[PDB]
Amino acid sequence: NAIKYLGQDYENLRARCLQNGVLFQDDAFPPVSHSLGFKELGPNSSKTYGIKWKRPTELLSNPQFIVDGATRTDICQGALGDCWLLAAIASLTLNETILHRVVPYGQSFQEGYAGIFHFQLWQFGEWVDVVVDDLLPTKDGKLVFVHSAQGNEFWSALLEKAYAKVNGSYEALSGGCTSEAFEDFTGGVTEWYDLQKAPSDLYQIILKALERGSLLGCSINISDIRDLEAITFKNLVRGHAYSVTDAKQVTYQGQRVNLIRMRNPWGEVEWKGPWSDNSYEWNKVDPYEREQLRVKMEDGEFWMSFRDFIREFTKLEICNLT
Ligand SMILES: *[C@H](C(=O)OCC)[C@@H](O)C(=O)N[C@@H](CC=C)C(=O)N[C@@H](CCCNC(=N)N)C(=O)N[C@@H](Cc1c[nH]c2ccccc12)C(N)=O
Numbered sequence: 001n002a003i004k005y006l007g008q009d010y011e012n013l014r015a016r017c018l019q020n021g022v023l024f025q026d027d028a029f030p031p032v033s034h035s036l037g038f039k040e041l042g043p044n045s046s047k048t049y050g051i052k053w054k055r056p057t058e059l060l061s062n063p064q065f066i067v068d069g070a071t072r073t074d075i076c077q078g079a080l081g082d083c084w085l086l087a088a089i090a091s092l093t094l095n096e097t098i099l100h101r102v103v104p105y106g107q108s109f110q111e112g113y114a115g116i117f118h119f120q121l122w123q124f125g126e127w128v129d130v131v132v133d134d135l136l137p138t139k140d141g142k143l144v145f146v147h148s149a150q151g152n153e154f155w156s157a158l159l160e161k162a163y164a165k166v167n168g169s170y171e172a173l174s175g176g177c178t179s180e181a182f183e184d185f186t187g188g189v190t191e192w193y194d195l196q197k198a199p200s201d202l203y204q205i206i207l208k209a210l211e212r213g214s215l216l217g218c219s220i221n222i223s224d225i226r227d228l229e230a231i232t233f234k235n236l237v238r239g240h241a242y243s244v245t246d247a248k249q250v251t252y253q254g255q256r257v258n259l260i261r262m263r264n265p266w267g268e269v270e271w272k273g274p275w276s277d278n279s280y281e282w283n284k285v286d287p288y289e290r291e292q293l294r295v296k297m298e299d300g301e302f303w304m305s306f307r308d309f310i311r312e313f314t315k316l317e318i319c320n321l322t
């Protein structure tokens with residue numbers, strides 16, 4: 001059994017709120033500016049000024065904790081520099097077992113609802129249960145930070161809030177290391193690869209990692225400072241964490257081509273080179289591979305050849321589960 005962060009007891013708090021006819025408000029991470037941040041999201045900042053804390057049950061008639069699965073499309077970054085955390089959550093969803101350790105089953109906005117949710121994280125050398133109230137930062141009725149493509153879905157928003165909580169505030173999340181998020185979801189072992197020095201068996205390493213349900217993400221280090229833009233010529237975002245979500249081989253004009261699939265945690269802004277959703281390359285693979293693999297959609301997720309991936313990106317991080 002997970003130990004209670006700060007002694008806060010999810011089921012006890014929930015049953016007591018329901019008995020008392022109230023919705024939970026979290027003393028440990030209250031719905032006030034200090035839970036947003038301290039500087040950029042401080043009490044005297046532009047960003048903070050627009051923000052009102054509202055429950056999904058105040059936003060919508062039918063809020064849902066999970067809709068059509070807890071899946072990577074549910075992870076669409078908002079106005080916070082927490083790409084590294086969101087990339088890890090999207091990777092997490094590909095491993096159903098570790099997903100539902102972090103995201104306990106049986107949580108909802110209907111029967112037993114008392115405005116409190118909980119998540120489990122690997123923190124302080126312990127698996128910890130973390131509670132949150134479901135007050136969320138909103139502006140003009142819309143979530144400011146993470147949201148799902150499914151606008152009535154709230155699990156990822158609540159998980160991001162619980163992760164903010166353990167780190168002190170949402171602002172505390174602005175900038176970080178994907179592998180740090182991977183570890184907090186697994187207690188696993190992280191390693192990283194310098195892609196300009198990729199071992200010759202790197203594609204097999206990625207294949208095996210994905211098969212065992214390890215978490216993988218990737219990034220392009222901005223080397224000069226940002227002095228060729230943040231967005232590259234072929235629509236990649238530098239210094240930005242992407243989730244690695246698949247690796248598959250296609251037969252391209254009778255020749256095997258190793259592909260890798262990645263996802264921008266923005267849920268949009270995709271690679272425009274070979275194997276991108278609209279690329280010609282797909283005209284030349286057999287129709288069955290093309291239909292299994294290519295999804296023509298602005299969803300943040302796209303394919304690159306492994307060759308192009310290693311030239312464009314600089315760093316792969318892999319968290320292996322023990
Ligand atoms: C995530 C993102 O939201 O993209 C925007 C939509 C992205 O900003 C991000 O966090 N990227 C990180 C890795 C993902 C690929 C990344 O490249 N760097 C952060 C981790 C480095 C941690 N610091 C360290 N090891 N010393 C990062 O940028 N961290 C901070 C940078 C920083 C450090 N000191 C600073 C002083 C002044 C200004 C910035 C400073 C940060 N807070 O951004």
Ligand SMILES: [Ca+2]
Pocket residue numbers: 066067068069070071074148150153
């Ligand atoms: Ca979903």
Ligand SMILES: [Ca+2]
Pocket residue numbers: 270277295296297298299300301302
């Ligand atoms: Ca796409």
